[PDB]
Amino acid sequence: GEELFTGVVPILVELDGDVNGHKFSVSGEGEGDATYGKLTLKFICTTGKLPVPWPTLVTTLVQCFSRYPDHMKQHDFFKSAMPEGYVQERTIFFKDDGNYKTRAEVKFEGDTLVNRIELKGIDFKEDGNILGHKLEYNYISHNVYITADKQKNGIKANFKIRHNIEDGSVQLADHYQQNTPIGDGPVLLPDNHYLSTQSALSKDPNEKRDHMVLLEFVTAAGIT
């Protein structure tokens, strides 16, 4: 699996979403360079206006592009599952608001690394921070704490994302994650460690569709 990531890899993302019955679709394209932990992607809402804030979809919208230190390469579950891939499931609990439940398959289709996602959101407040679009277009959170899930031949993670609200407050998004291989092949089950991620959000000044440009750098750490 490692060998599939030594160069620059094209990425395709497809998301189908339904949040309190507000249906939407997102497509994304770009590339990943795992040697540097570097992702460059542009996402488009193909159905018109996105009915939730873009920052709330960042974590849902390819941890196989993380840079694992040489000394930690035996802990890289995500690449080890390739090319057949993995299922990534989350529940994201927005404090004092609704929750997303996501199921994605991350796998190669030829030379392209594909992330295909279904997102279901329920129990949101129609005038809350999410459906009311009260979140700032920025990102402040960084670590994903990974542990092995031996019983499921995979991993789990939990981490908190804080999203800045327009009034200076923060909207917590508590993430619970589980990943399992798609194939029957072997995978690497890691010792406890984390991924340190930074995501920078911007706009394409020539793009009239609702969209998000993302530049991300991700490095594994915590074993030394």
Cβ of residue 111: shortest distance to Cl ion, in angstroms?
31
* Cα distances (Å, whole numbers) of residue 187 to 68, 78, 144, 181: 15, 8, 20, 8
Q: How many residues bind Cl ion (CB under 5 A)?
A: 2
SS3 (DSSP) at 178: strand
For residues 168 and 186, what is the distance between their CA atoms, to the nearest angstrom?
A: 47
Which residue's CB is nearer to Cl ion, number 54 or number 68? 54
Which residue's CB is nearer to Cl ion, number 53 or number 85? 53
Tokens at residue 162, please? Answer: 């804080």
Which of the residues 42 through 81 are near Cl ion (CB under 5 A)? Answer: 53-54
Cβ of residue 206: shortest distance to Cl ion, in angstroms?
18
Q: Give residue number: closest CB to Cl ion.
A: 54
Cβ of residue 184: shortest distance to Cl ion, in angstroms?
40
* Cα distances (Å, whole numbers) of residue 170 to 51, 111, 183, 210: 19, 39, 40, 24
Which residue's CB is nearer to Cl ion, number 110 or number 168? 168
Cβ of residue 21: shortest distance to Cl ion, in angstroms?
20
Q: Which of 18, 57, 23 is nearest to 211 (CA)?
A: 57
Which residue's CB is nearer to Cl ion, number 91 or number 164? 164
For residues 133 and 166, what is the distance between their CA atoms, to the nearest angstrom?
A: 9
What residues make contact with Cl ion under the rule CB under 5 A? 53-54
